[PDB]
Amino acid sequence: SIDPEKLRDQLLDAFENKQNELKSSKAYYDAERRPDAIGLAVPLDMRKYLAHVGYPRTYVDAIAERQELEGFRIPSANGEEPESGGENDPASELWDWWQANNLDIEATLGHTDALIYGTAYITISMPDPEVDFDVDPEVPLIRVEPPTALYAEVDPRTRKVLYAIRAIYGADGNEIVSATLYLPDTTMTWLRAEGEWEAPTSTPHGLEMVPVIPISNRTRLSDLYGTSEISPELRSVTDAAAQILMNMQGTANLMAIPQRLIFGAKPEELGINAETGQRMFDAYMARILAFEGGEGAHAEQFSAAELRNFVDALDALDRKAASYSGLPPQYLSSSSDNPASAEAIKAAESRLVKKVERKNKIFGGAWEQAMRLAYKMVKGGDIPTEYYRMETVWRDPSTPTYAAKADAAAKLFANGAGLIPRERGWVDMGYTIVEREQMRQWLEQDQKQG
Amino acid sequence: SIDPEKLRDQLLDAFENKQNELKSSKAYYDAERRPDAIGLAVPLDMRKYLAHVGYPRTYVDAIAERQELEGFRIPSANGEEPESGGENDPASELWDWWQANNLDIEATLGHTDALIYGTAYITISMPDPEVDFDVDPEVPLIRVEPPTALYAEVDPRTRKVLYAIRAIYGADGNEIVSATLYLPDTTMTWLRAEGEWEAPTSTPHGLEMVPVIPISNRTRLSDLYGTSEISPELRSVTDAAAQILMNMQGTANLMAIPQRLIFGAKPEELGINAETGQRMFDAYMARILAFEGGEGAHAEQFSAAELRNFVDALDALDRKAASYSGLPPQYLSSSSDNPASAEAIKAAESRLVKKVERKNKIFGGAWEQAMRLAYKMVKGGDIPTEYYRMETVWRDPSTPTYAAKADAAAKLFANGAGLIPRERGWVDMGYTIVEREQMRQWLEQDQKQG
Amino acid sequence: DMRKYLAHVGYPRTYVDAIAERQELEGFRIPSANGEEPESGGENDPASE
Numbered sequence: 001s002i003d004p005e006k007l008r009d010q011l012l013d014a015f016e017n018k019q020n021e022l023k024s025s026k027a028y029y030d031a032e033r034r035p036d037a038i039g040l041a042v043p044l045d046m047r048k049y050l051a052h053v054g055y056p057r058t059y060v061d062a063i064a065e066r067q068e069l070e071g072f073r074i075p076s077a078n079g080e081e082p083e084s085g086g087e088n089d090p091a092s093e094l095w096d097w098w099q100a101n102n103l104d105i106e107a108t109l110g111h112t113d114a115l116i117y118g119t120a121y122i123t124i125s126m127p128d129p130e131v132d133f134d135v136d137p138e139v140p141l142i143r144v145e146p147p148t149a150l151y152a153e154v155d156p157r158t159r160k161v162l163y164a165i166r167a168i169y170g171a172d173g174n175e176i177v178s179a180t181l182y183l184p185d186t187t188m189t190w191l192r193a194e195g196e197w198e199a200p201t202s203t204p205h206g207l208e209m210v211p212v213i214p215i216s217n218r219t220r221l222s223d224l225y226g227t228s229e230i231s232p233e234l235r236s237v238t239d240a241a242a243q244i245l246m247n248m249q250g251t252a253n254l255m256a257i258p259q260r261l262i263f264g265a266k267p268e269e270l271g272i273n274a275e276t277g278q279r280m281f282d283a284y285m286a287r288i289l290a291f292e293g294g295e296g297a298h299a300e301q302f303s304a305a306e307l308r309n310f311v312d313a314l315d316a317l318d319r320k321a322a323s324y325s326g327l328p329p330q331y332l333s334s335s336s337d338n339p340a341s342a343e344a345i346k347a348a349e350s351r352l353v354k355k356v357e358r359k360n361k362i363f364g365g366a367w368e369q370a371m372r373l374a375y376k377m378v379k380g381g382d383i384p385t386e387y388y389r390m391e392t393v394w395r396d397p398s399t400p401t402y403a404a405k406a407d408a409a410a411k412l413f414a415n416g417a418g419l420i421p422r423e424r425g426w427v428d429m430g431y432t433i434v435e436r437e438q439m440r441q442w443l444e445q446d447q448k449q450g
Numbered sequence: 451s452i453d454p455e456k457l458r459d460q461l462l463d464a465f466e467n468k469q470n471e472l473k474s475s476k477a478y479y480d481a482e483r484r485p486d487a488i489g490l491a492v493p494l495d496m497r498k499y500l501a502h503v504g505y506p507r508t509y510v511d512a513i514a515e516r517q518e519l520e521g522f523r524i525p526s527a528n529g530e531e532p533e534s535g536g537e538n539d540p541a542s543e544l545w546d547w548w549q550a551n552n553l554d555i556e557a558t559l560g561h562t563d564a565l566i567y568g569t570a571y572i573t574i575s576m577p578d579p580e581v582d583f584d585v586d587p588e589v590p591l592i593r594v595e596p597p598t599a600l601y602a603e604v605d606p607r608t609r610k611v612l613y614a615i616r617a618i619y620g621a622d623g624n625e626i627v628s629a630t631l632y633l634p635d636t637t638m639t640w641l642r643a644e645g646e647w648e649a650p651t652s653t654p655h656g657l658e659m660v661p662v663i664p665i666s667n668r669t670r671l672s673d674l675y676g677t678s679e680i681s682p683e684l685r686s687v688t689d690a691a692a693q694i695l696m697n698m699q700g701t702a703n704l705m706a707i708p709q710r711l712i713f714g715a716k717p718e719e720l721g722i723n724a725e726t727g728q729r730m731f732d733a734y735m736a737r738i739l740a741f742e743g744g745e746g747a748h749a750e751q752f753s754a755a756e757l758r759n760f761v762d763a764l765d766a767l768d769r770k771a772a773s774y775s776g777l778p779p780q781y782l783s784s785s786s787d788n789p790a791s792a793e794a795i796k797a798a799e800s801r802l803v804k805k806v807e808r809k810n811k812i813f814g815g816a817w818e819q820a821m822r823l824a825y826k827m828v829k830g831g832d833i834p835t836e837y838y839r840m841e842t843v844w845r846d847p848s849t850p851t852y853a854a855k856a857d858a859a860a861k862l863f864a865n866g867a868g869l870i871p872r873e874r875g876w877v878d879m880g881y882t883i884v885e886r887e888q889m890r891q892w893l894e895q896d897q898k899q900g
Numbered sequence: 901d902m903r904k905y906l907a908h909v910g911y912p913r914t915y916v917d918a919i920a921e922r923q924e925l926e927g928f929r930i931p932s933a934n935g936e937e938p939e940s941g942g943e944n945d946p947a948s949e
Contacts, residue, residue, distance in 0.1 A: 031682040052683040054774035099839045105815045112670035132658040136838045146671040253490040260752040293714035307763045333769040334779045340794040406858030415867040425869045442871035536935020
């Protein structure tokens with residue numbers, strides 16, 4: 001074993017060493033300055049005019065904003081007929097804790113950090129009564145915390161957490177203001193900076209396990225810890241397009257104009273003011289200049305640069321950024337078409353839908369595990385064996401074509417004489433578990449009237 | 451612990467130092483002068499003719515104008531929903547307070563500051579009969595107030611507000627005319643109307659928490675205080691396009707026409723006046739000039755600058771600003787195809803609608819806390835535990851399509867034989883909570899007629 | 901001498917008119933006493949006053 005006094009210092013070093021990697025992925029989503037984004041042709045005083053490219057934010061938002069949780073399924077004993085009535089089902093308890101914590105806000109935030117940095121953590125406890133918070137005392141306190149504020153050590157053998165630590169910085173600056181340890185046996189916390197530390201506040205803990213569950217963006221089994229969604233291909237076209245935008249911008253300031261010259265005309269004959277090198281001439285539009293013609297003088301000009309030449313590369317890098325991201329080609333530099341039919345929308349979005357349906361699986365596992373820990377912690381003792389088959393249920397990531405579903409669900413149900421039972425029509429219309437519940441009350445109330 | 455007069459001064463200095471940040475985000479929404487917006491190629495005399503670019507205001511308004519609140523929703527014992535209507539159910543008190551404060555006017559207004567600056571604050575109080583002569587004395591007085599007039603210190607430990615201060619400037623903006631402290635259990639107010647601070651008025655409020663709540667534009671968990679919606683990439687394309695407009699306009703004023711030259715002709719042979727360097731000649735259209743034209747004299751030109759060279763860069767930067775913002779392409783690109791059908795509308799708006807649905811989740815979390823604090827201040831004691839499961843219900847951000855919804859809802863209801871109960875068809879048609887309450891009474895008055 | 905030929909541009913007129921010509925009030929709603937929301941113009945009510 002190791003002392004809790006040492007278990008800060010031993011892995012706050014690892015917490016700080018993590019921040020050097022996280023800062024790389026942040027620069028792409030926050031659209032910060034990068035050496036690789038600076039366009040090389042622009043002269044060194046004009047290089048202050050950074051151009052930033054929104055592909056990383058566009059891709060991470062297009063995933064993160066389409067996923068939402070409807071509820072949980074827990075397989076009942078004696079057949080799939082559970083209900084929220086007297087002696088209510090397991091799922092209506094876990095959904096009450098989801099609502100009472102506002103996890104429908106904290107999850108949609110925390111999935112964004114999980115996509116940017118590759119992981120985020122779900123923290124479980126009872127609420128402390130002594131701090132007077134706006135929380136129901138009877139529910140487990142569940143909240144999501146970013147990898148910028150929390151760290152965990154994962155066992156290489158079993159791939160489950162051994163140790164975890166929060167570090168909370170001051171309102172500005174690099175100084176810590178609180179740190180907290182999670183261990184299987186206990187949670188412990190400190191309320192001052194590095195040096196001047198308080199004595200440990202401590203809480204004894206009911207689980208065999210650390211009450212910190214990693215959400216992680218595992219693309220693949222050989223991702224041990226999850227990986228940033230802002231892939232090296234998408235970074236490459238972001239930095240490449242930023243250079244084309246800066247060089248185009250420099251060209252518009254320096255060369256989109258033809259530069260006009262006269263050769264063989266003596267500065268003395270033109271009446272150039274010798275101490276400034278310039279002659280002003282009164283230049284309203286139609287006037288004709290006439291010269292003595294010097295040493296057999298003539299006019300010349302350097303031609304303008306074609307700004308179109310850079311735009312033909314901006315379009316090509318947009319075409320690559322769409323292909324790597326799998327966004328519908330109406331996003332980014334918009335294509336010469338828009339999907340004008342309910343089927344053509346599913347044709348355009350099919351990649352983005354299947355990537356969000358894939359994220360809904362790998363984040364579902366972390367939420368199911370956190371709900372088992374929250375139950376085992378608040379109810380105490382054992383977990384009922386059916387909770388090992390618990391599944392999250394998520395909204396369809398596609399744009400809801402309501403009228404195209406309504407014709408189809410009506411033709412299938414056919415006033416009760418048709419192919420499907422009433423509740424399957426309600427599922428296919430995409431009504432959430434809480435809506436399909438309340439429609440039973442309205443349908444029973446309609447059946448009093450006929 | 452801290453002296454209120456010291457704690458008033460100590461964070462008036464913090465409220466003031468924050469204004470040096472907010473003036474940057476204001477400059478993009480107002481379209482103030484920026485150094486980065488000035489097109490470099492125009493000569494010093496013409497840099498006065500600034501071009502102001504509207505992408506930031508176009509984006510922030512396009513979100514803020516689609517957000518609206520229909521009403522609150524709260525659970526109940528045994529699943530007993532409210533029925534027949536017009537009685538004070540748990541949510542109808544909260545909606546009466548929303549109406550009585552005109553928050554339907556003030557909230558959509560204050561969400562604009564929450565998107566521009568990244569935060570705005572909800573201030574909660576009881577009416578003062580000596581000052582608040584224009585309000586119902588029985589409702590809590592709830593106001594939304596900008597970060598240019600209120601400041602608050604959140605604890606990075608557990609995210610509660612510890613302290614907050616209003617400061618009001620006089621109509622000239624030279625000095626503070628009043629300040630107010632919101633402490634956890636009491637409020638204090640000072641005046642400066644004819645000199646330095648008078649002794650404070652005060653009001654105990656006895657709540658466990660400060661009656662100031664931040665609305666914040668939380669981008670992700672790591673974005674602790676929320677950030678401006680006018681992101682660094684949308685700033686950089688706004689300033690880039692403003693330079694192109696100044697260079698194009700300066701080129702039109704000075705070089706969009708040929709410059710006409712004659713070489714080898716002596717000014718004295720042309721009869722050019724020696725006091726002024728000019729000769730006027732009558733220039734009605736078809737007149738032919740003739741010159742003695744010795745020693746290889748000839749006419750020639752400099753080319754016009756081709757203004758469509760800059761327009762090919764404006765078109766490219768419009769595709770970038772549309773890409774970064776996620777607006778429909780017809781807001782910015784403008785020449786692009788208008789959506790021809792209800793499904794094409796749901797495709798083109800898809801990313802803007804999904805962005806507004808995200809803001810409805812995030813800002814809804816602050817308005818439910820305002821209603822919990824308002825209930826605690828009006829009724830006293832502790833909240834009925836159902837209020838921790840409160841939900842804000844918002845208008846669908848989608849551009850309406852009443853004909854397609856009517857074709858669908860009629861096919862699903864099938865004159866009462868169909869798939870869904872009558873009240874669900876009213877929800878799917880988008881009739882708001884306060885309007886379904888009227889239909890539920892007109893339907894009964896129609897039922898008495900047969 | 902030709903700068904007397906002013907070129908007046910109508911975007912501000914066009915924008916302010918295209919808002920102002922859409923705005924039209926068509927009544928006031930006052931919520932009824934005791935939850936009895938239906939009232940009608942055959943007798944005096946707060947809306948009609």
